[PDB]
Ligand binder design. Structure first.
Ligand code: 8DB
Lengths: 195, 198
């Protein structure tokens, strides 16, 4: 059930598609980035077409929509990484088993591109190029995190296996989210940029 | 896609079903266990009906079946655990982030045994305060595997010049496998829970 806006993949299951500057899709993703990163230089934006990762993510989304008895479980967030991790993320997505982890041992995603644009996250490569993903994240119902969590806390410790979907730094005004399970995050676009 | 011989769960997403001795389904599990654990006695065997874990597992199996083309990717293995872990595994499956270091480590992941005798060690199936020991029978997507190494946090690449094309799992010995380690969520479906005693 591959999305309409994907382009044909000649019966293959993985491809990175470079977006055409000035078209609707490129403009929308560029705007999300330049909202906080207007001083950077965008080299290119690529659409990640990973059939298997999409499949696994959409199953978790359908499950969370049933569990939570509503949609609104999804947010678009940013994730900066080093060049040597980009092939892994494109093919396999995010892995908690692979920086500060103050809110738990999961994968971190930022509300603002400016945060992911820090050199500690989007490490500039031997040519000055920096890499940041635009990510579909199943944040669902969330609570404040804490150091040492390996899963989100329970919603009520009377039922210890019924968990929050994610954690955050601040529930009223979140700036980061942490997810603790594979296929809770789909890397949708890769931005290559310089300072 | 739920299997047609499961009990009707009446819109519920999760149920444990107590099996009857003398049914083929009970007897095959009892025989698989007693092949190496004849000194122990089974209290009960429960079929685990977890709709969401099943869906996510069967998606991964279909993907590995496509990618590997005509491999037997699935093995039926054992996993001993403590009573405190049983409610989490029943609902959420096998989480590598909660796994202990194994006495012989072939990587940082969830361990599954070929022989029930391995899982029956008190180190894994810790007796509870009533002397009950707990062991899962698990469908595991072992896929294409190689000998593991203690450093691993994912299976190793098949080819060092293509680091993202991975083995599906690792083992202690490729010629005579006795354990498998998996490093990803929804690569193992907890199918039965054996409760047993000395
Ligand atoms: O874009 C990111 N890429 N990798 C990260 O590890 C990461 C981590 C991150 O917040 C980590 C914390 C800050 C304060 C306390 S905990 C934010 C963004 C990213």
């Amino acid at each position: 059930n591959l999305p309409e806006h994907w382009t044909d993949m000649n019966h293959q299951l993985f491809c990175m598609v470079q977006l055409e500057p000035g078209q609707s899709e490129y403009n929308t993703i560029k705007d999300k980035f330049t909202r906080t990163c207007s001083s950077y230089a965008i080299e290119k934006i690529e659409r990640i077409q990973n059939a298997f990762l999409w499949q696994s993510y959409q199953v978790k989304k359908r499950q969370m929509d049933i569990k939570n008895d509503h949609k609104n479980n999804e947010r678009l967030l940013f994730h900066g990484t080093d060049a040597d991790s980009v092939p892994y993320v494109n093919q396999h997505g995010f892995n908690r088993s692979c920086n500060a982890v103050s809110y738990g041992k999961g994968t971190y995603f930022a509300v603002d591109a400016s945060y992911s644009a820090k050199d500690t996250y989007s490490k500039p490569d031997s040519n000055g190029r920096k890499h940041m993903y635009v990510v579909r994240v199943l944040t669902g119902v969330f609570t404040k995190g804490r150091a040492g969590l390996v899963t989100p806390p329970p919603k009520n410790p009377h039922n210890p296996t019924d968990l929050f979907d994610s954690v955050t730094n601040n529930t009223r005004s979140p700036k980061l989210f942490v997810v603790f399970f594979d296929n809770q995050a789909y890397p949708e676009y890769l931005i290559t940029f310089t300072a």
